[PDB]
Ligand binder design. Sequence first.
Ligand SMILES: COc1cc(-c2cncc(-c3ccc(C4CCN(C)CC4)cc3)c2C)cc(OC)c1OC
Ligand SMILES: COc1cc(-c2cncc(-c3ccc(C4CCN(C)CC4)cc3)c2C)cc(OC)c1OC
Ligand SMILES: COc1cc(-c2cncc(-c3ccc(C4CCN(C)CC4)cc3)c2C)cc(OC)c1OC
Length: 283
Amino acid sequence: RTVARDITLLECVGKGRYGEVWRGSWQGENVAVKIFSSRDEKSWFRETELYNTVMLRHENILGFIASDMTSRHSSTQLWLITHYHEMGSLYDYLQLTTLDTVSCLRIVLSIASGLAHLHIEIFGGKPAIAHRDLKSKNILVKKNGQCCIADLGLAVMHRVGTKRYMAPEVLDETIQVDCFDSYKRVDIWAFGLVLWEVARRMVSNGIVEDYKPPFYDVVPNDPSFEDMRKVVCVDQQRPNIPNRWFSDPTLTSLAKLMKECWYQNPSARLTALRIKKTLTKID
Ligand SMILES: COc1cc(-c2cncc(-c3ccc(C4CCN(C)CC4)cc3)c2C)cc(OC)c1OC
Ligand SMILES: COc1cc(-c2cncc(-c3ccc(C4CCN(C)CC4)cc3)c2C)cc(OC)c1OC
Ligand SMILES: COc1cc(-c2cncc(-c3ccc(C4CCN(C)CC4)cc3)c2C)cc(OC)c1OC
């Protein structure tokens, strides 16, 4: 039989230290192709090892198609091939889109749904998985208004995370490194920050905040580890809740939720399953 492997790369939709992401075409269909830099080969290996262990399939997890290693004269070429989401990342989308109540809740409940699927051990199934780099750039927007979580290159099964999104126990190096629940609680902190990023873009009473990243008002661009530790650990700052949220029942409930993702004590934070239940009871 014929095995048609050729993927046509059509346009670059992302370029970074990680490497590049391309829109590509296979058998008439869009795919996304991540081409890894030599510097980030371990992310390809980790994601590949995870998908070789458990073929994750969930509407709120970026859909795996293939992992390819190709021999070159003096290098190895590493590609990850996934479903393609033409609307791009949540980070992108929030820059120049505002949200209504239904669209804001749909976005955050879909993220919670994908995160709970990662976190839960299923017997018979899947190991429990912590993401370790959850942020708005690692979430894609689907045409149906739900999102999906991307990038399992740092994931752990039962490179460091993006510093802006690191929980206090990562910054002060007190995290219980041998304890798997610790890694779930790090993801919940980062989820709370994403929830704040999204909520800001939800209109109420004709008011909306501009897109900003978490801690935009207290750290520089590309904040250092120390910059983050002073804000989050020493001063124990948290993102601002605008007064206008307290006129809106949805944003009032979301503020409460994000507070319960940001406790200094990791074991006080809500679980992804409890976040889902809370979001299903809002509106
Ligand atoms: C090697 O590399 C790539 C391959 C492909 C690809 C192309 N045509 C057909 C296939 C195929 C799938 C599955 C079977 C099954 C049939 C049932 N039988 C009981 C076991 C085997 C056969 C063939 C594949 C996997 C695409 C690629 O890119 C999208 C590849 O590159 C990453
Ligand atoms: C990698 O990705 C894609 C792959 C393919 C594809 C191409 N040839 C053959 C297959 C296939 C056929 C049959 C089986 C069997 C397995 C045993 N079981 C008891 C009955 C079924 C498995 C696999 C597929 C899945 C198509 C795709 O899109 C249309 C892919 O997506 C980009
Ligand atoms: C986070 O991580 C990964 C993401 C993706 C991925 C999947 N679908 C779509 C995208 C995308 C498409 C288009 C835009 C922009 C640029 C084009 N237009 C002018 C505006 C929109 C942005 C983003 C991406 C980047 C794939 C990955 O692996 C293959 C990723 O790594 C796991």
